[PDB]
Write an enzyme that holds these catalytic residues in place. Structure first.
Site, PDB file in Angstrom:
ATOM      1  N   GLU A  53     -69.677   0.653  16.209  1.00  0.00           N
ATOM      2  CA  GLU A  53     -69.667  -0.777  16.510  1.00  0.00           C
ATOM      3  C   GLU A  53     -70.860  -1.167  17.383  1.00  0.00           C
ATOM      4  O   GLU A  53     -70.710  -1.613  18.521  1.00  0.00           O
ATOM      5  CB  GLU A  53     -68.348  -1.182  17.173  1.00  0.00           C
ATOM      6  CG  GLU A  53     -68.114  -2.680  17.209  1.00  0.00           C
ATOM      7  CD  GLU A  53     -67.908  -3.276  15.829  1.00  0.00           C
ATOM      8  OE1 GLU A  53     -67.684  -2.503  14.874  1.00  0.00           O
ATOM      9  OE2 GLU A  53     -67.972  -4.516  15.696  1.00  0.00           O
ATOM     10  N   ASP A  54     -72.058  -0.990  16.832  1.00  0.00           N
ATOM     11  CA  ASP A  54     -73.314  -1.409  17.444  1.00  0.00           C
ATOM     12  C   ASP A  54     -73.659  -0.617  18.697  1.00  0.00           C
ATOM     13  O   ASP A  54     -74.370  -1.126  19.568  1.00  0.00           O
ATOM     14  CB  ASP A  54     -73.297  -2.903  17.778  1.00  0.00           C
ATOM     15  CG  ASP A  54     -73.147  -3.770  16.547  1.00  0.00           C
ATOM     16  OD1 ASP A  54     -73.546  -3.320  15.453  1.00  0.00           O
ATOM     17  OD2 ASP A  54     -72.632  -4.901  16.671  1.00  0.00           O
ATOM     18  N   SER A  55     -73.172   0.611  18.821  1.00  0.00           N
ATOM     19  CA  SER A  55     -73.598   1.517  19.877  1.00  0.00           C
ATOM     20  C   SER A  55     -74.629   2.495  19.325  1.00  0.00           C
ATOM     21  O   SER A  55     -74.917   2.526  18.127  1.00  0.00           O
ATOM     22  CB  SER A  55     -72.399   2.268  20.463  1.00  0.00           C
ATOM     23  OG  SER A  55     -71.621   1.421  21.287  1.00  0.00           O
TER      24      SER A  55
END
Ligand SMILES: [Zn+2]
Ligand SMILES: [Zn+2]
Ligand SMILES: [Zn+2]
EC number: 2.7.7.6
Lengths: 69, 45, 56, 42, 309, 49, 49
Positions: F3-5
């Site tokens: 998730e966008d890490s």
């Protein structure tokens, strides 16, 4: 601002090849691809370290020293 | 006591609380406080 | 309401003055004192009231 | 008649400074902004 | 002469008076530095309010009337008309009107904000006194400005002030002496003057005079040394500081060989050429003592470059 | 890195990857509050301040 | 051991943005309160809630 001492990815020492790289481009009439290989930089992680470096130190050295001895 | 440095002619000056803030040699009005003479420790990490 | 609200009370004859907590006097650097906007308006009311009282 | 007092330079000096120091174009908003210097492209 | 109404924070347990108190601003607590007991909680910090300076206006809260997002000119005109017809504010309006004129006068001469603040303060302190009732308002404003400039170490000359405010020197001098006496009287009552308050303070005039002539900073420093050492000669010490500075500047002008004639130096600074040359003769005999030793030692300027009569 | 890490090489960080300097400036003036009140730059003592 | 899948692998130009966590992390158990409302002050720099 100045050539990094080590390659970021694998840690190979690349800070002692900046002057050699510039010399090869100027005096040896070599393209950047051949000069990098002659210096022993085979992994593309090391090639981009020297290939994409910007020497901003030269621009800073143009300013007169703030405190002269 | 305190030693200051002019910001235009790099002349080292010594100013007191009463002396006016200005270079006596070239006339500049911007002064840089001199580097501290006490050693400073740094970690090489 | 006969006790809680009469038409005569909708006209102001005596004006209550809020206490300082409602209109605190702030300070920026503690060497300069500022007054609340209510105090500025309240002072004008006093000046106008005295001016009217003296006039008539 | 004193020409030095007839001409008030403060009028022009402050009028231009005020309109440029702040975004209030008068005496519109946001006409003047602090230049962004985070990076060259900015 | 009134109720105490004072709160002092002391630790009940320690009972040491005076107590060691540390104000933890971050934690919002006042705690005893010895036992750690918290003495007071929920301390407040130290828009909706306005800050005004109670030194130039005292205690005077007033609000103006102006147009809003929707307003009719009829109400604004009459409401402003009603506000003007007030007796309490009339007395203070005269002082406020004086401040407005002082600001305009100070702003027309390109002076720093400190001068006008000092000038306005001087006017308020010396206003509403029996001594200053037969003097023209122009003299009072000029005297206050001169006092304000002196307090800021940028003191001007009488002629410079007289250029903007037109008042004959007799009234100007009398007003200034009276004003200084008032300041001294109120200084002992509760400072006001320092080494700068001295009338001569010739060193302050040199930087501006040389600037008007466009001389380099090196010449200005030499003139300052010459003027400072110029007070050791009795024949020149009693002269006016303006003449002392101008003649000192003239000596340095010829010392560095700037192609500027005396006819223009006296025209720009409004000093008689004869006075400049007349003072030069007295100042010419003491040239050896009026030149900076370091400048001559280095070799930048030699005493043989000064023409002799 | 969900998730966008992202996951970043710690060794690369140690060697100077994406390291930067930060400069902050603090301004202060010697205010002149009218005539009597004035400020100065000094090292206050616990007995006089 | 070899990863069963093959990984898309190559250089790419990345940028470090201005948002650092050390400039955002902040907590408050108790602290200064506003003069008017007597509630926690606003702002990370002022230990606000
Ligand atoms: Zn590598
Ligand atoms: Zn200098
Ligand atoms: Zn205690």
């Amino acid at each position: 601002m100045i050539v990094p001492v080590r390659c970021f990815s694998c840690g190979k020492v690349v800070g002692d090849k900046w002057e050699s790289y510039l010399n090869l481009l100027q005096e040896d009439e070599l393209d950047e691809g051949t000069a990098l290989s002659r210096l022993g930089l085979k992994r593309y992680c090391c090639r981009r370290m020297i290939l994409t470096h910007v020497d901003l130190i030269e621009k800073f050295l143009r300013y007169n020293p703030l405190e002269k001895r | 006591t305190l030693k200051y440095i002019c910001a235009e002619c790099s002349s080292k000056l010594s100013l007191s609380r009463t002396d006016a803030v200005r270079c006596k040699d070239c006339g500049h009005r911007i002064l840089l406080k001199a580097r501290t003479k006490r050693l400073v420790q740094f970690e090489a990490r | 309401n006969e006790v809680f609200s009469r038409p005569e009370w909708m006209i102001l004859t005596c004006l209550p003055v809020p206490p300082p907590p409602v209109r605190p006097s702030i300070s920026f650097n503690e060497s300069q004192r500022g007054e609340d906007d209510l105090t500025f308006k309240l002072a004008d009311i006093l000046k106008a009231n005295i001016s009217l009282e003296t006039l008539e | 008649f004193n020409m030095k007092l007839a001409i008030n330079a403060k009028t022009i000096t402050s009028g231009l400074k005020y309109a440029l120091a702040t975004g209030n174009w008068g005496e519109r908003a946001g006409v003047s902004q602090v230049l962004n210097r985070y990076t060259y492209s900015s | 002469r009134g109720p105490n109404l004072n709160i002092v924070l002391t630790c009940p347990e320690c009972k040491v008076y005076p107590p060691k108190i540390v104000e933890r601003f971050s934690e919002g607590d006042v705690v005893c530095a010895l036992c750690g007991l918290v003495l007071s909680d929920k301390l407040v910090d130290t828009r909706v309010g306005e800050a005004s300076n109670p030194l130039l206006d005292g205690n005077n809260l007033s609000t103006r009337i102006g147009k809003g997002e929707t307003t009719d000119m009829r109400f604004t005109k009459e409401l402003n008309k009603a506000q003007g017809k007030n007796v309490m504010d009339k007395k203070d309006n005269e002082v406020q009107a004086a401040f407005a004129k002082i600001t305009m006068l100070c702003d027309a001469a390109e002076l720093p904000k400190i001068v006008k603040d000092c000038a306005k303060e001087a006017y308020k302190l010396c206003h509403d006194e029996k001594t200053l009732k037969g003097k023209s308002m122009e003299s009072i404003m000029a005297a206050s400005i001169l006092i304000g400039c002196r307090r800021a170490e940028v003191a001007r000359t009488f002629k410079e002030i007289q250029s903007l405010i037109h008042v004959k020197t007799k009234e100007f001098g009398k007003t200034l002496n009276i004003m200084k006496n008032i300041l001294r009287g109120k200084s002992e009552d509760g400072k006001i003057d320092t080494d700068n308050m001295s009338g001569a303070q010739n060193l302050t005039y040199i930087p501006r005079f040389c600037s008007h002539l466009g001389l380099p900073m090196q010449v200005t420093t030499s003139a300052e040394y010459t003027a400072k050492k110029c007070k050791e000669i009795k024949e020149i010490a009693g002269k006016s500081p303006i003449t002392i500075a101008v003649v000192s500047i003239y000596l340095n002008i010829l010392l560095f060989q700037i192609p500027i004639t005396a006819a223009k130096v006296g025209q720009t600074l409004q000093v008689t050429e004869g006075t400049i040359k007349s003072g030069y003769k007295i100042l010419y005999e003491h040239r050896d003592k009026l030149v900076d030793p370091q400048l001559i030692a280095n070799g930048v300027v030699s005493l043989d470059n000064l023409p002799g009569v | 890195n969900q998730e966008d890490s992202m996951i970043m090489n710690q060794s690369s960080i140690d060697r100077g990857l994406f390291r930067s300097l930060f400069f902050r400036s603090y301004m202060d003036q010697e205010k002149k509050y009218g005539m009597s009140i004035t400020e100065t730059f000094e090292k206050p003592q616990r007995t006089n301040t | 051991k070899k990863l069963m899948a093959q990984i898309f692998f190559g250089p790419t130009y990345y940028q470090r943005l201005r948002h650092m966590v050390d400039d955002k992390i902040h907590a408050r158990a108790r602290g200064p309160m506003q003069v008017l409302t007597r509630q926690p002050v606003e702002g990370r720099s002022r230990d606000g809630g």
